[PDB]
């Protein structure tokens, strides 16, 4: 389960599944059994934030990448990017966080290295 684990999303007990096999490499999460779903792709998120090891909260949030230096123009010339959109969810296992964190760390690093 290096790319799979159980984490609470949107404050609703559920499970996560990483799709590192796919080119775009994304993380898909669904409720424990609430016919719910939540999927995020690095293409929109280029950063992940997790808690420290000494901590016991086991949780990480992913950023929806910003164009601080990639913003687009419109007409005013200021050329700015809309307000970024990030997501945050909590874990419920020691390996679940590290297994995926170690996964996202690579993918993020991949999409972070390209830019």
């Amino acid at each position: 389960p290096s790319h799979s684990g159980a984490a609470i999303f949107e404050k609703v007990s559920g499970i996560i599944a990483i799709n590192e096999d796919v080119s775009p490499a994304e993380l898909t999460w669904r409720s424990t059994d609430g016919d719910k779903v939540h999927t995020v792709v690095l293409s929109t998120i280029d950063k992940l934030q997790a808690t420290p090891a000494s901590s016991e909260k086991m949780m990480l949030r992913l950023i929806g990448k910003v164009d601080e230096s990639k913003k687009r123009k419109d007409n005013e010339g200021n050329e700015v990017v809309p307000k970024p959109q990030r997501h945050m969810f909590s874990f419920n296992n020691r390996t679940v966080m590290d297994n995926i964190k170690m996964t996202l760390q690579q993918i993020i690093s991949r999409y972070k290295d390209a830019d």
């Binding site: 934030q49 997790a50 808690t51 420290p52 901590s55 909260k57 949780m59 949030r61 945050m88 290295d113």
Partner: protein, 35 residues
């Protein structure tokens, strides 16, 4: 065919993300030293 009938992204307001984002701001000291 499938059009959104109900959707209010700005309907679930919560100040938890603020205090939660604080504990969620750079919580890793494995930076520097290479890339």
């Amino acid at each position: 065919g499938f059009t959104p009938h109900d959707s209010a992204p700005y309907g679930a307001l919560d100040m938890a993300d603020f205090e939660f984002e604080q504990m969620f701001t750079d919580a890793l000291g494995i930076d520097e030293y290479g890339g």
